Design a protein around this ligand. Structure first.
Ligand SMILES: Nc1nc2c(ncn2[C@@H]2O[C@H](COP(=O)(O)OP(=O)(O)NP(=O)(O)O)[C@@H](O)[C@H]2O)c(=O)[nH]1
Ligand SMILES: [Mg+2]
Lengths: 163, 310
């Protein structure tokens, strides 16, 4: 069983912990409790093999260079509800490429809170546009609350690490 | 801007970082407040300090970072261990005082998964003695939980190899017993998956696993280390297990259950030397002495857990 070091990055309140906890524990985290640094472990099956995922759930309110050095795959999460969180991701993408010293880094752009259509600020096509800008990066809109595209975030990173 | 923090681990190797608002003077109770746990989830667990060869439950008033600092001295007081090789970490684990009657009514998914992870850890390490049938049932539940539904295409043949078995049976059974259980394990696994009466909700399956662990004699035990002399008094290193049911001795090397005594059926006496305690077993006229510098801790816990029992 191969181990996969995944890192969930993004600004405060976007749902990094909620996505990670839904994926790992099958629980929706309702209360907002700002993360300092949490790590989770989860065995899953991807492409006919058992994989042990070690998922680092990072602080969004604000060790980062180390996370990027060690990490094999990165989920860059914003909330479709908050423009600033979408804006903040460009610098994180650039930081990862710098630390890795390559464009060839497993990555996925995640527009979370897609159950909140009434509060949407960042259009889906703006998310798609950013992903294309990023060398045709993987992109999903997700909901930790509705269990929409939650597993798919982490499975896609595993597949990317495997190529 | 600046703050101090500590990682609180669980038995699966996961951790949560918690803010230390009073530095190394922060207490266990304060750290428990700092977790992501409801007043629901919190009462079942507390902070333990654990290295490779000693794990101790801390009191709510202890300052865990000071226990980490003082670990060499603690090891010298309570054991004869190599201090250099013991580097302790702080863990969230089941409170040894948690009554089984309370645990049996727990419905909270997070509490269940935390208890489940810890129980699985104990099972795989060999600290749960049980008949083959029980271990097979536990293994089948682990397959459902970890791998999902049985599929003939995936599981019927060439699936339960020695690597796979390591994750679902005790390490003590891997070489001589487990290889002969594969068909029995696969049968129960298939039966779980195809039985619509069996809920496949994760927390339901995890609770079923716990339900099968609750009658195991050493369930929820705090373990201490010691020695007994055979009744040419050859030394046998032992684990002393103390839980809400009573006292349990395991052979340290084999994890074999040497004796299991329920509260009300035995008495104890702290040795006047304080390097041991004596046990007197009833309807038996049989007695034994366990040598350990944790004797004081063992007797205090026995008193507390016996005292809890109605
Ligand atoms: N409606 C909805 N709410 C969500 C979703 N994901 C997270 N939330 C909510 O948004 C709040 C923040 O979520 P959380 O996962 O704590 O965000 P975070 O990115 O980990 N914040 P930090 O960086 O400070 O640790 C919580 O109240 C949570 O319930 C979602 O998909 N839909
Ligand atoms: Mg968080």
């Amino acid at each position: 069983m191969r181990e996969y070091k995944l890192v969930v990055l993004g600004s405060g309140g976007v749902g990094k912990s909620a996505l990670t906890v839904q994926f790992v524990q099958g629980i929706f985290v309702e209360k907002y409790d700002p993360t300092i640094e949490d790590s989770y472990r989860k065995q899953v099956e991807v492409d006919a093999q058992q994989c042990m995922l070690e998922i680092l759930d990072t602080a969004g309110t604000e060790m980062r260079d180390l996370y990027m050095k060690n990490g094999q795959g990165f989920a860059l999460v914003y909330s479709i509800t908050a423009q600033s969180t979408f804006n903040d991701l460009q610098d994180l993408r650039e930081q990862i490429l710098r630390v890795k010293d390559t464009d060839d880094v497993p990555m996925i752009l995640v527009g979370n809170k897609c159950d909140l259509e009434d509060e949407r600020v960042v259009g889906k096509e703006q998310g798609q546009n950013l992903a294309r800008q990023w060398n045709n990066c993987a992109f999903l809109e997700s909901s930790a609350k509705s269990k929409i595209n939650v597993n798919e975030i982490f499975y896609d990173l595993v597949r990317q690490i495997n190529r | 801007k600046p703050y101090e923090k500590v990682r609180i681990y669980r038995m699966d190797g996961s951790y949560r970082s918690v803010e230390l608002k009073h530095g190394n003077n922060t207490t266990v109770q304060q750290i428990m407040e700092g977790m992501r746990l409801s007043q629901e989830t919190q009462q079942y667990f507390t902070i333990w300090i654990c290295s490779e060869n000693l794990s101790l439950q801390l009191k709510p008033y202890h300052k865990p970072l000071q226990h980490v600092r003082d670990w060499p001295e603690i090891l010298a007081e309570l054991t004869n261990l190599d201090p250099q090789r013991e580097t302790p970490q702080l863990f969230l684990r089941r409170d040894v005082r948690l009554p089984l009657e309370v645990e049996k009514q727990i419905e909270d998914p997070l509490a269940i998964l935390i208890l489940f992870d810890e129980a699985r850890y104990n099972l795989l390490k060999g600290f749960y003695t049980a008949p083959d049938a029980k271990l097979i049932t536990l293994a089948s539940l682990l397959l459902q939980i970890v791998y999902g539904n049985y599929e003939s295409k995936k599981h019927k043949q060439g699936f339960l190899n020695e690597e796979n078995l390591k994750s679902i049976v005790p390490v003590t059974k891997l070489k001589s017993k487990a290889p002969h259980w594969t068909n029995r394990i696969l049968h129960e696994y298939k039966n779980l998956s195809t039985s619509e009466g069996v809920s496949k909700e994760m927390h339901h399956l995890q609770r079923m696993f716990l339900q099968n662990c609750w009658e195991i004699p050493t369930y929820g035990a705090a373990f201490f280390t010691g020695q007994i002399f055979t009744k040419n008094h050859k030394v046998i290193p032992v684990y002393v297990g103390v839980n809400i049911k009573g006292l349990h001795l395991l052979n340290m090397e084999t994890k074999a259950l040497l004796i299991s005594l329920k509260y009300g059926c035995f008495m104890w006496q702290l040795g006047d030397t304080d390097t041991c305690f004596q046990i007197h077993s009833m309807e038996n006229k049989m007695s034994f002495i366990v040598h350990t510098k944790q004797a004081g801790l063992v007797v205090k816990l026995l008193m507390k857990l016996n005292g809890q029992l109605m």
